[PDB]
Structure 1
Amino acid sequence: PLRKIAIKILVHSLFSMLIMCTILTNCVFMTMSNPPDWTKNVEYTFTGIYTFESLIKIIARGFCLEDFTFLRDPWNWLDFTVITFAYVTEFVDLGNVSALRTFRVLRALKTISVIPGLKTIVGALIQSVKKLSDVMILTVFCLSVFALIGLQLFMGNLRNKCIQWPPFDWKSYIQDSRYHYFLEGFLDALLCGNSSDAGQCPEGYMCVKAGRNPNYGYTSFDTFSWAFLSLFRLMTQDFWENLYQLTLRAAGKTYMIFFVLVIFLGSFYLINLILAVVAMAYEEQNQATLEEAEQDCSPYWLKVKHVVNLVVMDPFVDLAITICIVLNTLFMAMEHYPMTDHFNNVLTVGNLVFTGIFTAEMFLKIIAMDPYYYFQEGWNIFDGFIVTLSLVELGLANVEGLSVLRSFRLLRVFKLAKSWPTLNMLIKIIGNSVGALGNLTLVLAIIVFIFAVVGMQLFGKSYKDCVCKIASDCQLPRWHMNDFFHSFLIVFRVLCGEWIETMWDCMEVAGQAMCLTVFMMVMVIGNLVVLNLFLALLLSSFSGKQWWNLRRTCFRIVEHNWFETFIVFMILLSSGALAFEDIYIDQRKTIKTMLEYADKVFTYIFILEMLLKWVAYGYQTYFTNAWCWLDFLIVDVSLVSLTANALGYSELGAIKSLRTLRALRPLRALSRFEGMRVVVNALLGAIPSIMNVLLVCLIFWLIFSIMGVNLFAGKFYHCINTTTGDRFDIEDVNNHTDCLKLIERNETARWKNVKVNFDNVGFGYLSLLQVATFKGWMDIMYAAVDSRNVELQPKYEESLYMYLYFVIFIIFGSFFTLNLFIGVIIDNFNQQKKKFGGQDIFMTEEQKKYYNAMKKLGSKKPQKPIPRPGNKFQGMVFDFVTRQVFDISIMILICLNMVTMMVETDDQSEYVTTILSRINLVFIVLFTGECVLKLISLRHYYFTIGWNIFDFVVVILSIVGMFLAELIEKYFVSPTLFRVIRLARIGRILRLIKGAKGIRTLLFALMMSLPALFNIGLLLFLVMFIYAIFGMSNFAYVKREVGIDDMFNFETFGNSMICLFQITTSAGWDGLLAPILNSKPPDCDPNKVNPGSSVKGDCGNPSVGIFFFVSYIIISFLVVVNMYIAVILENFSVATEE
C-alpha cells in the first residue's frame, strides 16, 4: 500500500523515460532568451514534476521515518540542490534584480543522471584528466619563467605610442589619445620605437611611452599577471601573430629571437607533452577495459522478372554505373557562376540524363530480388533514397532558398565505397562517430549545450546593456551571447581555438573575473572532451693506355676529401650571395658588380664539377642517381640563361623569368649534409600513402566545394563607396541595376568581389583551405551569412543560418578527414619502423651513437660521493649543511626569491624599487653564503654532479650582474643592455628543477628529442631560405594592403624571413595572400615608377602567389607533422621504458 506502490514505480523504465523526456523538453525550453508568460506556468509544471520525482525517491529510501533519506549518490546531491534552489526562489524575494537565474541550467545537467551510459563516460574522463598533474606543473613553471623574461624585457614597451606636437606642461599632453597617430581606422594607437629596426614614425610624431595598452588595455608585459595572460595566448597560438607584430614594432625586430624561442618551446613542446600524456592515459584505459573483458499477377510477374534477373549480374553493367557516377561528378563539378545558357543547357540535359539512367537502372534491378527482398543490403536502401529524392526534387521547381536538394544528388558519389576501400574506411569512421562512440559525442553535445546556455544566462543581458563599450554604431558585434545560436557559435569558435578576440569583448562588458573563469573552464573542458573523442575514434578504428689512366686521376680527384668540402663551401657561398638581392642592390655599385662576377664564377665552377663528375663516373653511373639528376638540372637551367645572356637574347618574356630560377640553387646542399638527406628520404618513402589518402580527402572536399558553389558563388558581390570601404545598405542600393544606376550618375560605388569565394570549384578548394586551417574564415563567413541572392546586394545577416554549413564542414572535412589521415600515418609508420628493423629515423649515422650514450647517461644515480671533511669544525659544519633540512630550506628560499621577482612592475615608485633591490641583494648574499659554506663542507671536489656546478655558474652570474650595476652609472651606458644583463638572475629560478623529480624526466626527453629535431629544423630552414628568395624576387614590390606594411613585407631578406617564420605555423597567411591576389586597377597601378629599381608594377600575379602560399602551407604542414611525430615517438619510448 503505502510503501509498496512507491518502491514499484521507482524501478520501472516507464518513469525513467518520463523523467528523461521532461528533462529534454526543459532543456529545449531554457534555450529561449525571454520566455513568455505561459512558459512560466510551464516552469511551474516542471518544478512540480521534479518535486514528485524527489518525493517518490524520499518515500522509497526514507519511508515510515527511518532516520534519513536518499543521500550517498553525488547526482542526488545535484537533484536536491536544484529542487532546493527552485523552492527557495519561489519564496517571494531573493534579490529582485536577479543574479541566480544561471543556477537553473543545473536541471539540464541532470541529463548525465538518467541517460543510461553516461556516468561511466564522465568518470572515465576524470580518470584521464588525473594523469596530467606533472605536465600542468611543468607548463605553469615554464609559463611563469618566460613571463618573467618578457616582463623584464618588454617592461612597458607595449605602451609605446606616437605622439605629435602642440599648436609647465606635461602628463596631460600624453593622453587624451587625440594627439596620437591612428592608421586609418584601427582604433588602437599605432606603436613606435626609438631604436632602429623598430617601428618608425611619420613626420613630427615622436615616440613617448604614454597611454593605456593594446587592444583594450588587456595586452601588456608589465604586472606579471598580464604577462602570464599574454604568454598563455602565445602557448595556444591564438592570434599570436598580433603580439608578435606589436612587439617587434615597439621593441625592435631583433627580439624575434624571443618569439622563436617562446613558440618552439611552449607552443610546441607543452602541447606535445599534453597530447602524449592524454593519449598514454587513453591507451592504457582501453587496454585495461579489453583485459577485464577478457576474463495472374504473381506468376507472370515472376515470368517477366526471369529474363531481367538473368541480365544484370554478369556484364560490366554495375561498372558502367561506376563510370556514370564519376562522370556525373564531373558534370556537376563544371558548374560556376557566369555561364552562358549554351552551357547551362548541357548542364541540365546531362543532369536529367543521369537522373534518367540511374532511376531506370533502379526500376529494372529492383525486380530481380523481390521488393522487401531487396531492402536488406544497406547500400540498396541508400541508392533508393537517392533515386527517390532525385525524382521528387525534379518536378517541384518551387523551393525559394531551399534549393539544397540540387545537392542531394551529390551523395551518390559514396557508391564508389563498394570498390574504393579508403572511402569505405572514412565512412566506417563517420558512422562509428554515432555508433560505438555515440554516447561520448552525446556527452560532448550536452557539454556544448550547457556552456552555450551558461554563457547566455551569465553574460547575455550585458552584451545588450553595454553595447556602446564594444562597438562603433552601438550595435551587437558579429559574435556575442545575447541569444542561444550566437552563444553556441562562440563556444564552437573557442573549441576551434579562437578564444581571445571574444574574451576581450566579454571582459569589457561583464567583468574580468567572471569572463576569465567561464572562458578558461570552457577552453579546458571542451578541448579535453574534443581530444578524448578524437583519440577514441582513432585508437578504436585501426586497433686505353691513357684514357683509362686519366679516369683514375679524375676519380681520385672527385673522391678526394678536399674536393667535396670545397664544393659545398662554394654551394654555401653561392647561396649566401642570393640574400644580398634587396631593393637597395641598385644603390651599392660596389657589391652589385662583385655579385655579378661571382654569379659567373660560380656558374663556371659548377659546370667544371659536373664535367669532372661525368668524366670520372660515366653516364650510366651518373644518370641512375636522383641527386646527380637534381644537380644536373640546376646547371642546365643556369646554362640556358648563360647562353641567353651571351648570344644576344638579353631580355625576353622567358629569360627575364629564368633569373628567378636561381632561387633553386640552395637545393645543392641537400645531397651534402646527412641531416637533410635523411629527412628527404623519410618523406619520399611515405609520400605514396599520403597521396592515396589525399585522393579521398580531395573528393570529400570536392563534395563540399560543389555544395558551396550551389549555395554561394554569385552572392559574394557588393557595392562599397571607395571613400571609406563601407557597405551600401539595402535601403540605398538593392541590387546590381541600382549600383549601375549610381555609377552612371558619376558616383563612387564599387561593385566588388571577395577574391576568395566559391565562384568556381577551384576557388572553392581555396576557400575550404582557409576555413579548415582557421586562418581567414572570418571574411568568408561574413560574406556567406549575408548572402541574400545572386546579383542582389548582400544584407547584414539575412541568410543567418548558413553558419551551419561551415560548422558541418569544419566537423566532417576537418575533424574526420584529419582523423583518417593520422590513422593511416600511424599505420604506414608502423610498417616502416617494422621494415627497417632498426629504429629512430630522422637521425644520421653519427647522431645515433651520440643518442646511444645519452640513453645510458639517463638511467643511473650516484652512490656515496662524499668521504668527509676529516676532523675539524668543518666536520660539524658538514653535519649541519648536508642534511635534507638545509636542502629543502634552500628550495623554499628560491621560491620566496621567485615571489619577490614577480612583484616587479612598470612605472613603480623609487621607494618600492629601492626596497626590492635591497631584498634582492639580501637574497644574493644568502645564496652566496649557501655556496661558499658548501665549499667548506665538500672541500675536495664540490664539482661532481652538474647541479652544484649550475649553482656555481648562476651565483657567479648574479655577482657579475650586481657588480656592474654601478658601472652603468660611471662608464659605458645603455639601458636596453641593462634590461638584458639583469636577466641573469632568472638563472636562480632554474634551480627549482633539482628537487621536482619528474619534471626532469620530461626535460630529459626534450634533450633526447633535440638531435632528431635539429635535422628537420635545418631542412625547414632551407625551405624557408628558398621561399624567402622566391618572395624577395616576386613579392618584393606588392601594394601595402592589410597584410603587408612597412615592418613585415618581402623587401629584404630580414623582413622576408620574419614573415616566413610567421607563416610557418600557418598563422596569418590569409592577410599576406590578400594583397597578392590583386591583379589590375582599380585595385593596383600596373605602371609605377617606384624608386630604387627599373621594375615597375605594384602588385604580383595571383597564380604564382597562390602556388607559393599553398605550396608552402602544405610543405610546412608535412614538415611540422614529422616534427610532432619525432617528439611523440620519443615521448612514448621513455614512459613505456620506465
Structure 2
Amino acid sequence: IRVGCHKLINHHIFTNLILVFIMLSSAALAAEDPIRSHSFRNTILGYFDYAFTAIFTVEILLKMTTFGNYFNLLDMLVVGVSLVSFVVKILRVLRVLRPLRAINRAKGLKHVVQCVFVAIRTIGNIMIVTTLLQFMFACIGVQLFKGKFYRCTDEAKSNPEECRGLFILYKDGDVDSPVVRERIWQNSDFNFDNVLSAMMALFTVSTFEGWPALLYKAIDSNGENIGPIYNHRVEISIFFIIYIIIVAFFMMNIFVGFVIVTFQEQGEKEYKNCELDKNQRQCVEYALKARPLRRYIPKNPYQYKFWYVVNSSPFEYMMFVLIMLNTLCLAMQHYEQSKMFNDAMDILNMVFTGVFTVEMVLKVIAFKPKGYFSDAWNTFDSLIVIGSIIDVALSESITFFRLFRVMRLVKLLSRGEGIRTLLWTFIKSFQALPYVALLIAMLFFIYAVIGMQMFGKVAMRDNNQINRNNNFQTFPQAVLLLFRCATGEAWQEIMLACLPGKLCDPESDYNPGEEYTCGSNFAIVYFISFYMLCAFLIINLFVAVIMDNFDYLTRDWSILGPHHLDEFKRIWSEYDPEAKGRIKHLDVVTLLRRIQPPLGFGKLCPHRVACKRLVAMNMPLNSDGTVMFNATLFALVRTALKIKTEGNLEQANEELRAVIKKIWKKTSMKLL
C-alpha cells in the first residue's frame, strides 16, 4: 500500500525535517579539518555523516515507492557519491553538492535561481561581445609584448648569456651589508607570451588590480630576449589606457545598465491602466491601507506640566546641541595624552552621563512610563545610559560599555526628512528579498569548502600571500579570504601563491621526502570563476534591491506622495485625541488651513475656495459629528486625483471593486 508512504513524504513535518537535516549535513561538512587527516574531530564528524547519509538514503527509497524530474536525479547523485566513497579526492570534492539539494525544497530559492538563469540568458549578447574584444586585445598584446617581459635577478645583466652564476646583492641599498645571491633569468608572473597568458593578464588588468605594475613592466620592455630599460617607451601606455576605457569603463558599465533596464522593463508588466496610471495606483492604495493613531495625551495636569516642559522645540534643539558636544568631547582623545587631560575627560564624561540620566528620569516621569518603552528610540537610549552610568565608579570588559555612549549620535540620523526615509525604504527592501542573498551565501559556502579541500595544505609563511592571516585552513578564514577576493584586494597574488610548486605545512600526512606537492593548477579556474560569479551575483542582488522599491527612486515630489498623506494624518491627530473612528467637524477648517497647498489649501482666504470645495464635493450623509477616518482621507485623495462631475460617483466604487484589490467590506459607507 503505497499511500502511507505518500502521506509520510508529503507530511507537514517530514519536509521540514529533511530540509533541516540537509542544512545540518552541510554545516557538518563545513567543520572538517583540512590538514590533519588523522584527527579526532574528523572521526566524530565522519560518524555524523553515516547517520545523515542513511536518512537521505531511506527517503529516496521511500519516495521511489510511491513513484513509478532532474532534481530527483541530483539527490540520488549526492547519496551515491557518499556510498561509493565509503580516486577518493574527486568524490570528496563532489561531496560539496549537499546545499544544492535544498533548492527543490524552498520555493523562494527555486524562484531566485530561475530568475538568475533567465538573467544570464538575456544578457549573453554582451558577454560574447566583450569576450571577443578581450580576445582581440589579447592578440594585439601578444604581438606587442611577446617575450619582452623577461628580467634578470640583478639589474645589471640584460641578456640570458650574462644572467648566469652568482652576484653580490646589497641589502636595502646599503653598501656595507652585502650578500651573495644567484642570478636567475626569469619571466614575469603575468606576461603576453601566448594567447592564454595574454588573456589572463588582460583579465587581471580589467579587474582593476595589479594593473599599474603591468603597465610599468610593459613601458620598460626593450626587445625580444633582452632586459628592460627605465621608461623605454612611455607611449605604449596608450594600449593599456584604451583597453581600460573600452572594456572596464564602457563594456562593464553597459553590463550594469543593461541589467537595470531589463529589470525595469520586466517589472512594467502592470498593464492595468484602463482608468488609473502609476501615480493613482501608488497614491490611492495608501488611503485603503491606513490606520489612525492617537497622541497618548496624559491626565493629572500636575503630571502634564513635565510633559509640556519636555515636548518642545527648544528641548529637542538643546539635546541636539549636547549630543553634538558629547560627540566632540569623545572624538578628541589622542595618544599619550596628559594626566590632566585624562582627568578632565573623566569629569566631562561624568557630567554628560549625569545630564543624560536627568533626561531619562524627566522623560520617564513625564511620558507615562507604561508606554515610554513602546517606542524604539526611547528604549534605545535607555540601554545607552544604563551601560554608561555603571562605568562612573569603575574608572578606578569595561571597554564594551564605552562603545555604548558613541551610539547616541545615531539618534541624530533620524532628525532629517529624507535621509531617514531613504534608509527606511532600503532596509525594508532588503528585508523583502532575503532569498537573493542566500545565493551569495551558498556560493561562498561552496567555494570555501572547495578551497579547504584543494589548497588547505599550503604552508603558511610570512613573506607570501598565504600567511597566518590569509589561508584556507579554517572556515572563517577561508570565508574571509573569499570576501577579500570578492573585494578584489590581491586576488591574483593569492592565485599565484596557490600553484602546485608550494611547500606544505609539516602537519599533513604526506609522503616523507616530498613536501613541495600541495597546490594545483585548478587555482586559476577556481579564482577566475569565483570572481566572475561573485561579481555577477552582487550586481544581480543590487539591481533587485534597487528595483524592489523604484517608486521612491522616481517619486517626483512635486506632484504628490505618501509623505503628504502622512503629514495630513499627523496634523489631523492633533485635533483627534483618540483613533475611535468618527471625529469632530468643528475644526476641520483650521485643520485644512494647517495643511500644505498640495494637499490642503493655500495662504488665500479659505472661505472663498476651500469652504466651497469642502461641501460641494459629495460626502457621506452621516451625523453632525460622526465621520470615519477613511470617509475623510479617501474623499480627500479622490478630490486631489481625477476629479469628476456629479452623477458618476458610483464609477469610483466600480473602480474600487474591479481594478483595485478586494474592498473587504470596508467601502459600505464609502459607497456614498
Bin the TM-score by the shorter chain.
0.7 to 0.9
Q: How far apart are residue 958 of structure 1 and its match?
A: 1.7
In the alignment, which residue of structure 2 is the partner of 1:192? none
The residue that corresponds to 1:958 in the other structure is 385
1:608 corresponds in structure 2 to 58
Residue among 702, 705, 715 paired with 2:135: 702
1:1073: Cα distance to partner? 0.8
The normalised TM-score by structure 1 is 0.44
Q: Deviations over 1:262-318 (max 9, x none)?
A: xxxxxxxxxxxxxxxxxxxxxxxxxxxxxxxxxxxxxxxxxxxxxxxxxxxxxxxxx
Question: 1:946-978: per-residue Cα shift (whole Å, max 9, x none)?
Answer: 2xx523432343233331453586xxxxxxx32
Note if 1:1068 corresponds to 2:486.
no
For the residues of structure 2 that align with 1:827 and 1:866, how far apart are their CA atoms?
47
- Residue 897 (structure 1) aligned with residue 326 (structure 2): yes
Corresponding letter in the other structure for 1:574: S
- In structure 2, the residue corresponding to 1:617 is in which secondary structure? coil
Answer yes or no: is the 8 Å Cα contact 1:1009–1:1126 preserved in 2. no
1:935 maps to 364
Deviation at 1:1072, TM superposition (A): 1.1
Offset of residue 1059 of structure 1: 0.9
| Alpha-carbon distance between aligned partners in 2 of 1:832 and 1:738, rounded to the nearest angstrom | 65
Aligned to 2:297: 867
Partner of 1:1107: 525
Alignment correspondent of 2:260? 826
Deviation at 1:628, TM superposition (A): 2.3
- Structure 1 residue 1056, shift from structure 2 partner: 0.9
CA distance, structure 2, for counterparts of residue 1038 and residue 563 of structure 1: 42
Indicate the residue corresponding to 1:617 in structure 2. Answer: 67
Match of residue 119 from structure 2: 686
Q: What residue in structure 1 maps to residue 354 of structure 2? A: 925
* 1:567 alignment partner in structure 2: 18
1:680 maps to amino acid: V
The share of aligned pairs that are identical, in percent, is 32
Q: Would you say the 8 A contact 1:1075–1:1099 is kept in 2? A: no
**Is residue 152–residue 163 contact of structure 2 (8 Å, CA) maintained in 1?**
yes
Cα drift, residue 695 of structure 1: 0.8
Which residue identity is paired with 1:1009? S
Match of 2:8 in 1: 557
**Do the aligned partners of 2:142 and 2:193 also contact (CA within 8 Å) in 1?**
yes
Q: Is the 8 A contact 2:35 2:457 kept in 1?
A: no
Structure 1 pair 1002–676 and aligned structure 2 pair: CA distance change class (3 A): same
Distance 2:505 2:260 in 1: 55
Q: Is the 8 A contact 2:464 2:497 kept in 1?
A: yes
In the TM superposition, residue 1032 of structure 1 has moved relative to its aligned partner by: 0.8
Match of 2:448 in 1: 1028
The residue that corresponds to 2:421 in the other structure is 1001
Asked if 1:734 is matched to 2:168, the reply is no
Residue 43 (structure 2) pairs with residue 593 (structure 1): yes
* Matched residue type, 1:796: Y
Structure 2 residue matching 1:577: 3-state secondary structure: helix
Contact 1:558 1:616 in 2 (8 A): no
Partner of 1:756: 190
Query: How far is the alpha carbon of 1:790 from its aligned partner?
Result: 1.2
Secondary structure class of the residue paired with 2:152: strand
Does the 8 A contact of 1:675 with 1:1018 survive in 2? no
Amino acid at match of 1:1061: F
Aligned-partner SS, 2:204: helix
TM-score relative to the length of structure 2: 0.72
* Structure whose residues are more often helix by fraction: 1
Letter in 2 for 1:617: F
Partner SS, residue 736 of structure 1: coil
Q: CA deviation at 1:1128?
A: 2.2
Determine if the alignment matches structure 1 residue 991 to structure 2 residue 396.
no
Change over 3 Å in CA distance of 1:774–1:940 after alignment to 2? closer
Relative distance call for 1:1047 and 1:993 in structure 2 (3 A) is closer
- What secondary structure, in the 3-state scheme, does the structure 1 residue paired with 2:18 have? helix
Is contact 2:458–2:505 with CA below 8 Å preserved after alignment? no
Distance 1:859 1:737 in 2: 84
Whole-Å separation in 1 of the counterparts to 2:215 and 2:505: 38
| Equivalent residue in structure 1 for 2:507, among 1070, 1073, 1091 | 1091
8 Å contact kept, 1:1042–1:1074: no
Secondary structure of residue in 2 paired with 1:1110: helix
Match of 1:201 in 2: none
What is the rounded CA distance, in whole Å, between the counterparts of 2:520 and 2:288 in structure 1? Answer: 53
The aligned residue for residue 173 of structure 2 is none
* Contact 1:772 1:814 (8 Å CA) reproduced: yes
State the AA in 2 paired with 1:757: N
Q: Is the alpha carbon distance of 1:994 and 1:704 closer, same or farther for their aligned partners in structure 2, counting shifts above 3 Å?
A: closer
Equivalent residue runs for 1:230-249 within 5 Å: none
Instruction: Note closer, same or farther for the CA distance 1:981–1:882 as it changes in structure 2 (3 Å cut).
Output: closer
- Native 8 Å contact 2:444 2:479 kept in 1: yes
Report the 3-state secondary structure (helix = DSSP H, G, I; strand = E; otherwise coil) of the residue aligned with 1:754: coil
* 1:1132 paired residue among 547, 550, 562: 550
Task: Tell me the distance in 1 between the aligned counterparts of 2:395 and 2:366.
Answer: 37
Equivalent position of 1:1050 in the other structure: 472
Q: Deviations along 1:364-397, whole A, 9 cap, x unmatched?
A: xxxxxxxxxxxxxxxxxxxxxxxxxxxxxxxxxx
Q: Is the 8 A contact 1:869 1:939 kept in 2?
A: no
Counterparts of 1:1093 and 1:966 in 2: how far apart (Å)? 56
> 1:657 and 1:1117, CA in 2 relative to 1: closer, same or farther beyond 3 A?
same
* 8 Å CA contact 1:1037, 1:1098 repeated in 2: no
Aligned length: 529
Letter aligned with residue 1047 of structure 1? N
Are 1:794 and 2:247 matched, yes or no? Answer: no
Partner letter of residue 707 of structure 1? I
Aligned pairs (5 A) from 1:333-344: none
Structure 1 position 752, deviation (Å) = 1.2
* Residue 715 (structure 1) aligned with residue 142 (structure 2): no
- The superposition leaves residues 778-832 of structure 1 with CA deviations (integer Å, 9 ceiling, x where unpaired) of 3322321221111111223213222221111000111121233234323432343
CA 1:602–1:909 in 2, change beyond 3 Å: closer, same or farther?
Answer: same
1:864, 1:827 → 2: CA distance? Answer: 44
Residues in 2 aligned to 1:574 and 1:886: alpha-carbon distance in whole angstroms = 57
The alignment partner of 1:885 has SS state of helix
> Which structure 1 segments of 5+ residues have no match?
1-548, 643-653, 721-727, 839-851, 970-976
- Rounded Cα–Cα distance in structure 2 between residues aligned with 1:710 and 1:1055: 41
Displacement of 1:613 in angstroms is 2.3
Q: Cα offset for 1:568?
A: 1.9
Structure 1, residues 186-244: CA drift from partner, whole Å, max 9, x if none?
Answer: xxxxxxxxxxxxxxxxxxxxxxxxxxxxxxxxxxxxxxxxxxxxxxxxxxxxxxxxxxx
Kindly indicate whether residue 477 of structure 2 is the aligned counterpart of residue 1059 of structure 1.
no
Q: Matched residue of 1:1043: which SS?
A: coil
> Partner of 1:784 in structure 2?
218
CA distance in 1, matches of 2:286, 2:73: 42
Aligned-pair RMSD on alpha carbons? 3.1
Q: Does 1:628 align with 2:72?
A: yes
- Residues 705, 761 of structure 1: 8 Å contact kept: yes
Structure 1 residue aligned with 2:104: 671
Task: Give SS of 1:894's match.
Answer: helix
Contact kept? 1:554, 1:616, Cα under 8 Å: yes
CA distance 1:630–1:857, shift in 2 (3 Å): farther
